[PDB]
């Protein structure tokens, strides 16, 4: 009974990074080594664990977080990183245990004239906590003067479209990202690597 990773990796549309999706996976066999050795993924980095170790471990739940960012932001999906994605959109803990997977999605997520569906948060009063998801849309007050519902000097809308076009340079092309995290509860540990099965 193989984990339905297809539903996450092969989804026709992905979330905007500010409104990132989380899929719970349970009651199945996960082959992390087959994922790791796949040529479909150009980024595959594990923290606190490796794919060989995950092949020999059982968890209660696995979470697959997924979203789209531009290529030059892929480096921000790691512990201890700064920049607008890590600070304001999607944050890993310093002590992260799990895997960051990414691939170029220019053929799916870019459009002639721009794909404006994908957004990210450009501004926030403080940094996100790990695994926090902020979908708020209030004017960002960049200075001491209240905005009172009006955009202008130091009063900005907090979300920005990417507008992916196929001709973008690779740093500005869309990348699909999946982050795997692992949960152990006092409950049956029903997500297992093939060795612990």
């Amino acid at each position, epitope marked *: 009974n193989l984990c339905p990773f297809g539903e996450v990796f092969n989804a026709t549309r992905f979330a905007s990074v500010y409104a990132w999706n989380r899929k719970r996976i349970s009651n199945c066999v996960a082959d992390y080594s087959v994922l790791y050795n796949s040529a479909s993924f150009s980024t595959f980095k594990c923290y606190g664990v490796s794919p060989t170790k995950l092949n020999d471990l059982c968890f209660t739940n696995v979470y697959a977080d997924s979203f789209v960012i531009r290529g030059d932001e892929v480096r921000q999906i790691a512990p201890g990183q700064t920049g607008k994605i890590a600070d304001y959109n999607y944050k890993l803990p310093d002590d992260f245990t799990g895997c960051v997977i990414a691939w170029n999605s220019n053929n799916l997520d870019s459009k002639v004239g*721009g794909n*404006y*569906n994908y957004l990210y948060r450009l501004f926030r009063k403080s940094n996100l906590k790990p695994f926090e998801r902020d979908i708020s849309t209030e*004017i960002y007050q960049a200075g001491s003067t209240p905005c009172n519902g*009006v*955009e202008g000097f130091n009063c900005y*809308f907090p979300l920005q479209s990417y507008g992916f076009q196929p001709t973008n340079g690779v740093g500005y092309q869309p990348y699909r990202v999946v982050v795997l995290s692992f949960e152990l509860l006092h409950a049956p540990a029903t997500v297992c690597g093939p060795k612990k099965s």
Partner: nanobody, 127 residues
């Protein structure tokens, strides 16, 4: 595309006031941010003022800021341009429209970002 029903043009004295209206059924204005534009004869259609789909943010071109206001009714189906301290320079055809494009800096919006244009209404400020 959606139908935007635009009303309220006319002739007004320098220093006077007019209200334009833009209506759209159901959740249109709570889905897509809106903008008002204007076009003088042989000039480009320029941004005047708009409101985010949230209804809690409005924004204004430098030429109208502090003179014009945008508001939206409680039903969220009708947006108003309150034009005050009108000058002959404000004479133009005015249009409402909506955008799917989110720009954090409203200053970057142009007419090319907008669609579902309302019918142009003439505003004429006599001196």
């Amino acid at each position: 595309q959606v139908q935007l029903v635009e009303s309220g043009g006319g002739l007004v004295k320098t220093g006077g006031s007019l209200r334009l209206s833009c209506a759209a059924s159901g959740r249109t204005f709570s889905t897509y941010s809106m903008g008002w534009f204007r076009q003088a004869p042989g000039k480009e259609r320029e941004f005047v003022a708009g409101m985010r789909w949230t209804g809690s943010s409005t924004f204004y071109s430098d030429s109208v800021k502090g003179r014009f206001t945008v508001s939206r009714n409680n039903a969220k189906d009708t947006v108003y341009l309150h034009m005050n301290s009108l000058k002959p320079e404000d004479t133009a055809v005015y249009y409402c429209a909506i955008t799917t494009i989110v720009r954090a800096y409203y200053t970057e919006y142009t007419e090319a970002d907008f669609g579902s244009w309302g019918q142009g209404t003439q505003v004429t400020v006599s001196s």
